[PDB]
Amino acid sequence: VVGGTEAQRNSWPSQISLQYRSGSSWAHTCGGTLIRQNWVMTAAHCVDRELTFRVVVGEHNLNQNNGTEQYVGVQKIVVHPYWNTDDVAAGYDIALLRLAQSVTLNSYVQLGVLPRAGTILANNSPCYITGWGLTRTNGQLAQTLQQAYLPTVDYAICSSSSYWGSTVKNSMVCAGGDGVRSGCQGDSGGPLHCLVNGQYAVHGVTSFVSRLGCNVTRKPTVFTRVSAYISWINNVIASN
Numbered sequence: 001v002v003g004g005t006e007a008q009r010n011s012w013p014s015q016i017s018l019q020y021r022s023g024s025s026w027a028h029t030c031g032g033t034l035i036r037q038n039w040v041m042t043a044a045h046c047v048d049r050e051l052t053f054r055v056v057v058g059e060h061n062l063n064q065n066n067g068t069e070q071y072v073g074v075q076k077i078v079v080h081p082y083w084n085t086d087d088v089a090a091g092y093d094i095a096l097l098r099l100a101q102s103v104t105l106n107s108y109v110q111l112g113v114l115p116r117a118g119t120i121l122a123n124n125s126p127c128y129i130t131g132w133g134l135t136r137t138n139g140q141l142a143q144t145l146q147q148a149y150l151p152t153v154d155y156a157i158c159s160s161s162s163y164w165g166s167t168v169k170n171s172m173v174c175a176g177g178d179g180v181r182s183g184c185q186g187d188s189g190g191p192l193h194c195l196v197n198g199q200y201a202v203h204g205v206t207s208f209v210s211r212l213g214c215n216v217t218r219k220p221t222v223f224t225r226v227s228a229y230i231s232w233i234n235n236v237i238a239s240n
């Protein structure tokens with residue numbers, strides 16, 4: 001997250017860290033959202049490669065023991081059937097991970113709330129992005145969870161020639177673009193929490209940013225619109 005600030009520890013209990021084994025150690029690669037005691041929602045491009053993955057819940061400081069973590073393996077990766085790695089702008093950047101075991105829900109570990117199917121947010125709605133991704137374009141990962149206010153930019157405006165144009169589809173959600181705050185590599189797969197009816201729900205899964213950089217004016221961070229995949233998600237969890 002570029003231009004953010006440290007989140008109060010465990011204030012976003014559904015946020016998880018997706019790591020892969022590198023030799024004899026692990027490395028944070030993406031964010032994700034715990035939607036079931038044994039299911040995690042993330043980006044398809046995060047699990048595109050055949051590596052060994054593990055999920056960490058109740059995490060805050062990646063380099064220290066906060067005494068609130070739980071580490072569990074991934075036994076099943078279900079990528080959306082239409083996902084095309086060579087055409088991220090085509091959408092479908094979403095995947096579900098069945099955990100090897102069920103996490104225990106407590107003060108630091110809670111399920112994320114999903115919006116109803118087809119829900120579209122009004123322009124400039126209040127949302128927050130969270131993650132351990134780069135704090136600057138070509139910078140380095142943050143070691144403690146970061147958060148930044150990232151209001152939405154509706155489709156009409158986001159798909160215009162002044163912003164993303166044809167790169168963005170209606171199955172996506174845009175937020176930010178103020179040139180100061182934004183998601184960045186390492187935030188991918190993570191959540192976009194938006195305030196609706198008094199509660200925060202996960203409306204997006206971080207997908208991509210501009211090739212020019214993370215925080216670029218009029219180039220909002222692009223997220224997979226969760227409300228467009230509700231049926232798919234349920235059909236997967238119901239039969240797995």
Ligand SMILES: [Ca+2]
Pocket residue numbers: 059060061062063064065066067069
């Ligand atoms: Ca820790």
